[PDB]
Amino acid sequence: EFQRKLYKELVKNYNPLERPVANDSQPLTVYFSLSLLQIMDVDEKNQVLTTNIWLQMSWTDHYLQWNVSEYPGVKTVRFPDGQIWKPDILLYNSADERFDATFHTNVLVNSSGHCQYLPPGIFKSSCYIDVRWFPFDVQHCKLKFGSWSYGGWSLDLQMQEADISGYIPNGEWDLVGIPGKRSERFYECCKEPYPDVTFTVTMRRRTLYYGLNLLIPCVLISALALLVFLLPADSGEKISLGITVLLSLTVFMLLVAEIMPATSDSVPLIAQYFASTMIIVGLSVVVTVIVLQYHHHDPDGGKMPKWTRVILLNWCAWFLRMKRCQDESEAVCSEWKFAACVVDRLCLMAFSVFTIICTIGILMSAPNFVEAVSKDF
Amino acid sequence: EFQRKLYKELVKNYNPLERPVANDSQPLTVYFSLSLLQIMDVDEKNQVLTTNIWLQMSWTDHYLQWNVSEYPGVKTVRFPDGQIWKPDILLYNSADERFDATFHTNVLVNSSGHCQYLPPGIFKSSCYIDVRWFPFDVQHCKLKFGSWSYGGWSLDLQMQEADISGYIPNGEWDLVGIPGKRSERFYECCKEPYPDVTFTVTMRRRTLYYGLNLLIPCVLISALALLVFLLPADSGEKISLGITVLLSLTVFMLLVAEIMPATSDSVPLIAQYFASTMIIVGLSVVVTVIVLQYHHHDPDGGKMPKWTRVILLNWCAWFLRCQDESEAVCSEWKFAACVVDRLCLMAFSVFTIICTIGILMSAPNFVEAVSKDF
Amino acid sequence: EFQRKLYKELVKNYNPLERPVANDSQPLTVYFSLSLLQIMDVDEKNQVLTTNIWLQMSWTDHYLQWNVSEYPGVKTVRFPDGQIWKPDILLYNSADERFDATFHTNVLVNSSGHCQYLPPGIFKSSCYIDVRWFPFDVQHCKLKFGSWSYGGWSLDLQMQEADISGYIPNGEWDLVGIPGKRSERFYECCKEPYPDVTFTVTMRRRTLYYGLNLLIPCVLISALALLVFLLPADSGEKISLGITVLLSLTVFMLLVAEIMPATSDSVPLIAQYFASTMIIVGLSVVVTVIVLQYHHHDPDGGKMPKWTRVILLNWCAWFLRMDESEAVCSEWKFAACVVDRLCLMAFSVFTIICTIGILMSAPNFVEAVSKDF
Amino acid sequence: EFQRKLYKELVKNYNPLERPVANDSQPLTVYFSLSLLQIMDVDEKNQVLTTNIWLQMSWTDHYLQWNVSEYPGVKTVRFPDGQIWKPDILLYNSADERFDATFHTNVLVNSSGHCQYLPPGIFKSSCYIDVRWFPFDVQHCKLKFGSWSYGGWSLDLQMQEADISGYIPNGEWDLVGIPGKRSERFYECCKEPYPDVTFTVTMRRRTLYYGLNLLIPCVLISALALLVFLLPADSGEKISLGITVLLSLTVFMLLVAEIMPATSDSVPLIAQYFASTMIIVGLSVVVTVIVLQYHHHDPDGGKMPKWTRVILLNWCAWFLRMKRCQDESEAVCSEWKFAACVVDRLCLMAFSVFTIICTIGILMSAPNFVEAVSKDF
Amino acid sequence: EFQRKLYKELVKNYNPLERPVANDSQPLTVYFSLSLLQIMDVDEKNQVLTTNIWLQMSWTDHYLQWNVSEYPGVKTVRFPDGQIWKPDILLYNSADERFDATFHTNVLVNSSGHCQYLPPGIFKSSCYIDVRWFPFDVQHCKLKFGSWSYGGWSLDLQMQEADISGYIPNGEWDLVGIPGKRSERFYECCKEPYPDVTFTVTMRRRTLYYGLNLLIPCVLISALALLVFLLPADSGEKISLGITVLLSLTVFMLLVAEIMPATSDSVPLIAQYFASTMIIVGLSVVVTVIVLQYHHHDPDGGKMPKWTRVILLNWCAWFLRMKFRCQDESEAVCSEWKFAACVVDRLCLMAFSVFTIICTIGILMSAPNFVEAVSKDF
C-alpha cells in the first residue's frame, strides 16, 4: 500500500540523466571503495589480472527523500539500472573485451536520500607483471577507478579503505595489502581535471608450488648430470647420460615459456638460473668430450705434454689423494687414462662447487628469498 | 476471453519494483532450494565448479490473486522477466565472467497468489579445492545463494532441502550429498543483517580413471626402472634404461601439473608419491653409477678395501700370469658389483612397495575408494 | 495497403502472454519436431553433443486469423520475438552456457491462424557418452525438449518425426537414426504432469580415421618392439629398442586420453588395447633382461640346472629346429637364442590373439570393418 | 530544419513489419551480393570457414520517398535496426554459436525510395573440407544465403555479382573465384518455394608453408634414416639410429593431426605420404635386424646356405663391383660380414629407389600439383 | 533544479536520427583521433592486433546549446547511447566477432553545443603481420576508421594527431610511432566517396626474449653438435650425440611454428636460419657416418686410393699439424684408415664451424632492423 505509493511518487519528474544535487554549482561527493573477494587469476603471459571485486559506491540523492512516518514500515527502496542516476565509475586500465565487467544490481536508497550501490564483478585488469624475480616476485597491480565523464568540478570522488574481511585466500598469491590513493590528474582530452582512486594490490607469490615443481627438480636433475664425472669412461654411456638429461632440463624451460609474458623489459630470475644451469651441464658435456679424447688418445700417437704430465699426474693427482711394444702402448695409454680420471675428479669438485655457488648466488639475490623460505617452507 | 481479462486486470497499477507484501513492516517469506541435475565439470586449476542446476524459488505475491469462479478454466498465469517482482537471489561465490549464469524463465502464479520461479542455469562457482588427497580426494564445494539487496527485515529467505531425484551421475564425481545450512550473516557494508542459503556439495572423486591412467602405470614404469639391477654390467645399457625411464616418469608429472592448481596450500598426495618414485629411480641411477665404477675398476688402481671385502664379498654374499692375477682382482670387483646390484634390487623393491603403500594408505578415503571403485 | 490494415488489426488487444486458445480449459496442441542439419561435435571429454538443429514448432492462434478476401494478396504475416505468444519449448538437458542456444526468428502465420516457427540453433546437449567400445561405439545421445512452464493440462505437446533430408554427412559419425518419443512425466516440484519429447540421436562412429591413426599404427610399433628377440644379443641395443618403442606407445596413450572422457563407469576398449600392448612390450623387456642375463653369464658362476638344460636346450630347441669357459658360455649363449626364439612365437601369439579378441569383442566390429574399410 | 521534418514525416504510420510494396500481390525484388574482404581462418579440424564479409542487400521501399526540392539538401536518410523493414536474409549453413554474425548497421534510403544495407560481419560457415589432396587441395566452400521466412512469392531474391576488388589476400589461400548460383528449392516443412543465393568460394591452398614445414623435412629426415645402411655394423648404433629417426618422424604425424578433421570419407595425401615413409623406414629397421643377424652370426652355427652364397656373394656382389681353428672362424664370419655388407648396400639403393618413387608418385597424384609447384616455387 | 529544466528542454522535439546541422546542405565536421593506451596483443598466428584504444570524436550539435546565465552552474550535460546523434565511425578491418568492440559511454556536450565522445575499447583489427624479418621485424598495422553510412558530402571527417601520452609500454613492442592519414576513396557500392582516417601504428619488436629463447639456444646446442667432430671414434657414441642434438633442435622450431601464421607469402628470417643450422647439423650426421665408414674399415676390404691417401694424409694432414705379422700389417693398414678418419674429423670441425659462423652471422645481419635491435636491446 504505502510502498506502492512511494514508488509512484519518487519517479514523478525524476530524470536519470540529472546528477542528483540540490545546488548545481557544488560537486556531488561519492564515496568509493571495493571489497576484494578473491584473486582468481594472474595471467602473467597476457599481463592480465582477473579478480572478484564488489565495488562499493555510496552517495546522496537529493530527490529520493521521504518521511518514514508518512510511509510506515518503508525504510528502504531499491531501483534497477537505468531508472536512477548512477556514477559512471569505470576501471580505466581494463583488459576485458567489453571493458565493463561489472554486473548491474539494484541501488539501495534509505529515507534520508542516501543511495548505496554494490555491483559485483569479475574485473579483468591490465597489470604490468614484473617477472624479474619470478617465482620470488611481488607484484604491484594497479586498479584505477574514476568517473569516465564527470570531472572534479561535478563529481567529487572520495576514497574509503578497502575491505579484506570477506577475502578468501588464493593458495598461489598472498595478499600483502591493498593501499589506495586518490589523485587529481589532467588528461590531453580535456581541460577539466578528473579525480581517480587507484588501488595497488600487492601480491606475494607463495613459492612452495613452483619451488618444488620447477627449481628443486632442476637442481636434482643437474645433480644427475654431475654423476657423469664418476661414470667410468669404459661404460659407453658417459655422454648419453649428458645429452638425455639436457633434454629433460629443456622441458622445464618450455614450461616457463608457457606462462612468461612475451616482454623484453627484463630477464626473469628463474631464466638466469636455468640459463646458468644449462650452460654448466652443457659445459659438462664439453669436458666429457675432452676426457674421452684423453682416454682414447692413440698409443703410438704423439706423446703426452710435459705440462699435462705435471699439472694432472703430479700436482692434481696428489691433491685429490688418488695415486713388449704392446705393453708400452698400454703403459702410455694407461697414463692417458690416469690423466683422464684425474680430470674427472677435478671437474666434479669444480662443477659441483660451481653449481652450489651459482645456485645460491642467483637465488639469494632475490630480496624475497629470505621471506619466502621463512613463510612458504 | 477470461485469460485475456485476467492478464489485463493483473497488470493494473502493478509495480515490478514493489515487494508484493500486504503489511510493509513484515518480511516476505521466499522458499529457496535447488535441483542439482548434473556436475558438469570441476576445474581444479581455475578453482571453479561448473554445475547444471535448476534453482527453485517459491513465494507469495499478494497482488496476483484472482477468484477462479469468475475466471473459469484459468488456474495459472505466467509472467516473464521485468513484468513481475522477483527476488534478486544471486550466487555470492560466483566465478562466471557475467557473475549471473542464470537463464531468466517465467514466473508461474496460481490463483492464491502463489508464485513459482525455476530458472535453469550452468553455474560456475569459486570453489576452494582441497587437493591434498588427490586423487583419493573428497571435495566440499559451497554454493552460497542470497538476496543481493534485501536483508532479513525485508526478505525472509528459508531453505528447503535440495532435490537430486533427476540427478545424472558424472562418471568422475560421486555425489556424496548436498547438505544445506541457512544463516544470517552481517556485512561490513551495511547494518541490516543479510541471510543466506549455503549448499555444501559433498563430492567424492571416482578413482578408477586416475587410478589406472596415472598411478598404476607409474608403478609399472618404476618397475622397469628397478629392472636395471638385473642387467649384466657388460650389456652397456644400464644407464640408457635408467635415464630413459627417469625422464619418462616426468611425463606423468606434466599431466598431473596441467590438471592441478598452482596453490601452495599443501603438497598433493599424488605429487608426494610421484616425487618419491622419481627420487627412488634417481637413487637407482646413482647406485648404478657406483656399480659401474665397481665393475669398470682398473686392476692396477687401489687395492680392494677390507671393509668392502667383508661387507660385500663375505656377509652379503653368504646371506643371498700377470694378466691372470690382474683378471682375478677385476673378477672380485665384478662379483662385488653383482652383490651390490642384488642387495639394492631387494632394498629398492622394499622401499617402492613400502613407500607407495604407506603413502596410499595415508589417505583417509583409500579403503573406501578401492572397495567401491576397483 | 492491406498489409498495413491487417498488421494493425491483428495487434489490437493482443497480449503475447495469453496462450492463444478459444476455450481456456482445453489444451493447445503444439506439434514439435526437428531437422538435424549436422553433427558438429561430440565432445567426448566434456560429454557434450553440439548439433545444427532447426526446431519445427506448429500451432494455431485463435486471434491471428482473417479473410483473405478482405486483404487480397495477403496470405501470410510474420511476427518477431516479443509480439506473439510462443511455446517456451526448451532443451532440458542443455550444456550451453546460455541454456537456450535457439536463435529467435519470425513466426509465420497463415490466414487460418496456423503459426509456424522454425528457429535455427547450435544446440549443446549434456549427453552421456558410452566409451566402453570406443572406437567402435554407437552413441545414443538424447535431446529432451519440452515446455518449461506449461503442463499437459494446458499445452498438449505432440511430436512429428524428425527430418534428416537436409542432414549433411559428418565423416566421423554415421547417423544411424533419430527416433523420437513422447513421454508424459511427473516432476517432484509439481503435481500437474508435464509432457516432453525425446529424440535419441543414434550415431555410429566411422572407425577408419581413428583405426588408421591409433589402432593400426600401434600394432606395427608393437611388432617393432617384438623385433628385439631376433636382434643378435651382441649388437648392444636390445633394451634400447624395447624402451624407445614402449615410450612411443605411451605417446599414443596420452593422445587417446586427450580424447576420452574422465569416467569410471567403464574402461574404453582402446585403453585396454594400449594397456595390453604396453604390458606385452614390458614383459618383452623383462624376458630380454633374462636373455641378457643368460648371455652375459659368468662361466665360473652356477652350473646349468638340468631343468634349464633339457627344458630350454633340449626339448624347446628340438621343436624349433635350431676354451672350456667359452664352451660353457657358448652353451649359455645358445640358451639366450632359444629363449629369443621361444619368446618370439609365444609373445607373437599373445600379440595377435589378444588384439583380435580385445577388438572383436566389440559387438560392432564386423560392421565396422565392412563399412569403414 | 528539413531533415527533422522528413524524419518526422517518414515515421507517420510506418510499421517495420510490413513488406514495403505498393501492391500486396507482387513479390519484392531484393538484390543480394557480398564483398569478401578477407578469409580470416579455415578451421579444417572443425570443418568451419571464418570469413570477413560485407553483405550487400539493396531493395526499394515504396513508403520512404520524397522530392528533394521540398526538402532541399536532404537527398538521403538513414534508419537503424528495429525502425525499418529489412529482409531476414540469413546464412543457412552457419556455424556460429549465435547463427547471425551480421553486425546491424544503418539502412540508407535515397529520395527515390531505394534502400541500401551493407552490414559487416564475421561469418563462420560450415564448410565440408575435402582433405584427400591436402596440402595440394582446392576447397569449394558454400555460403548459402536466403530469406528465412519469405518464399519466392513474397521476396524475389536476385543475384548481384560478387565483389573482390577490395579483397586483401589471406596468405594461406589464393582466391580462385567466388562464382554464385541462384536456386529455387522446396523444403519438407512447407509448400511455398524458397529462393536462395549460394556463393561457392573456391580457394587454392598456398603450399610453401606446409611445403617446407611438413613435406621437405620428411624427405630429408628419411634420407637421414637411409644413412643407417652406410654405417659399419661394428659401430653398434644402427638400431638406435633407426628407432630415434622413426619415433621423431612420428612428430610430424601428431603435428599434422593437430589440424585435420576426424573425417573417414577419405585419407589425406599427406597421411598417405607419411604412412609410406614410415613403412619404408620400418622396413629399413627390419633389414637392419636381418643385417645384424648376418653380421653377429656365430661361426659355429648353421652352414652358409647355397642360395644365400649365390644370391648375395656371387650375383649381387658382382653387380656392385664389391669383391688355425680360430683363423677359420673369422674366415667364415668374414663371409658373413660381406654378406651383411652387400645386403646393406643393395638395400640402400633399393630402399632409396622406393623413397623417390613413392614420394614422386604420391605427390604427383594431386591433380593441381603442377600448378602448385609452378606458382608457389 | 536548473539541470532538470535543461534536460527537459534539450529533448523537446529532438530526434537522434537527425544529423545536427543548421544548414542541411553543409557537411558536418567531425574531428576524429585516438589515444593508444596499450598494445594488449599482437597475435601473429591469427593475423590480429588487439589494442586498448580510447577513440576521440568531437563535433558540434546545433540543437544542444544554451546560455549558462539562464542555467547557472549547468555548464555541461551528458547523454547516453540512443539519446543523442553520434557518428557511426567503425573500424573497417576489424577481426572481432561482433565487428565493433567500442564500449558506448556518455557523450559530453558543453554550453556552446560542442559534443565530445570518448568511447574506450579493446579493438581487434585484422592486420597483415609481415614476418619475413622475424624476430627483427617492424610491423605496420593499419586501423582504418570511418563513418559506415556517411560520405564526404554529409560528414566531413577530419584527422587529429594520435597520442601516446599514457601509452603503457608493452615489453615486446617498441612503438615507433602512430602516424595517421586522411584519404577520400570511392567504393564499388556507391557513388559518394567515403572519407577515412587510417592510423598506421609502427611497432618494433624487442628481440631480447626470442633472442635468448630461440636464436641463441640453437647456437649453443649446435655447438654441442659440433662437438661430434671432437669425439674419439672408439667411443662409438658419435651418431647418438649427433642425432639426439638434431632431434632436440626441432622442439624450438615447433614453438616457432606455434606463434607465426601459416602464410606462404614469405619465409621468416628465423625459419631460414633454423633451416641453415639444421642442414649443417644433418650434414654433420652424414659426415659422421662417412668418417665411421673410414674408421671401421675392414683391413681386407678395398685398398686405400692414392687420392684419399694424399688429400687427407699429406696435404690436409700437413695443414693441421697432426703428425702376428699379418695382423700387424692389417692393424697398420687399418690405422691409416683410422688416421684418415681423424683428419676428416678435424677438417669438418673447422669447416662446419666456419659455415656456422658465416651462416649464422650473415643471415642475422640480413635484417634491416638488426643493428638497431642489437644496439637498443643489448
Ligand SMILES: *[C@@H]1O[C@H](CO)[C@@H](O[C@@H]2O[C@H](CO)[C@@H](O)[C@H](O)[C@H]2NC(C)=O)[C@H](O)[C@H]1NC(C)=O
Ligand atoms: C566547448 O568546448 C569547445 C572545445 O573544448 C570549446 O571550443 C574551443 O575553445 C578553446 C578556448 O578558447 C579554443 O582555443 C578552441 O579553438 C575551441 N575549439 C572549437 C572547436 O571551438 C568551446 O569554447 C566550449 N564552449 C564553451 C561555452 O566554453
Ligand SMILES: COc1cc(OC)c(NC(=O)Nc2cc(C)on2)cc1Cl
Ligand atoms: C619435467 O620434470 C618434472 C616436472 C614436474 O612438475 C612440473 C615435477 N614436479 C614435482 O616434482 N612436483 C612435486 C614433488 C613433490 C613432493 O610435490 N610436488 C617434477 C619433474 Cl622431475
Ligand SMILES: COc1cc(OC)c(NC(=O)Nc2cc(C)on2)cc1Cl
Ligand atoms: C606414459 O605412459 C603411460 C601413459 C598413460 O596415460 C597417460 C597410460 N594410461 C593407461 O594405462 N590407461 C589405461 C589403462 C587402462 C586399462 O585403461 N586406461 C599408460 C602409460 Cl604406460
Ligand SMILES: COc1cc(OC)c(NC(=O)Nc2cc(C)on2)cc1Cl
Ligand atoms: C605417434 O605416431 C603416429 C601418430 C599418428 O597419427 C596420430 C599416425 N597416423 C597415421 O599413420 N595416419 C595415417 C596413415 C595413413 C595411410 O593415413 N593416415 C601414425 C603414427 Cl606412427
Ligand SMILES: COc1cc(OC)c(NC(=O)Nc2cc(C)on2)cc1Cl
Ligand atoms: C627447448 O630449449 C630451450 C627453450 C628455451 O625457451 C623457450 C630456452 N630459453 C632460455 O634459454 N631462456 C633464457 C635464458 C636466459 C638467461 O634468460 N632466458 C632454452 C632452451 Cl635450451
Ligand SMILES: *[C@@H]1O[C@H](CO)[C@@H](O)[C@H](O)[C@H]1NC(C)=O
Ligand atoms: C468466487 O466467486 C464465487 C461466485 O460468485 C463466490 O461465490 C466466491 O465466494 C468467490 N470466492 C471468494 C474467495 O470470495
Ligand SMILES: *[C@@H]1O[C@H](CO)[C@@H](O)[C@H](O)[C@H]1NC(C)=O
Ligand atoms: C471472409 O470474408 C469474405 C468476404 O470478404 C466472406 O465471403 C467469407 O465468407 C468470410 N469468411 C469465410 C467464411 O471464409
Ligand SMILES: *[C@@H]1O[C@H](CO)[C@@H](O)[C@H](O)[C@H]1NC(C)=O
Ligand atoms: C516535388 O516538387 C516538385 C516542385 O514542386 C514537383 O514538380 C514534383 O512533382 C514533386 N515530387 C513529388 C513528391 O511528386
Ligand SMILES: *[C@@H]1O[C@H](CO)[C@@H](O)[C@H](O)[C@H]1NC(C)=O
Ligand atoms: C543568455 O542570457 C544572457 C543574460 O540572461 C543574455 O545577455 C544573452 O544574450 C543570452 N544569450 C544569447 C546568445 O543571447
Ligand SMILES: [Ca+2]
Ligand atoms: Ca608475443
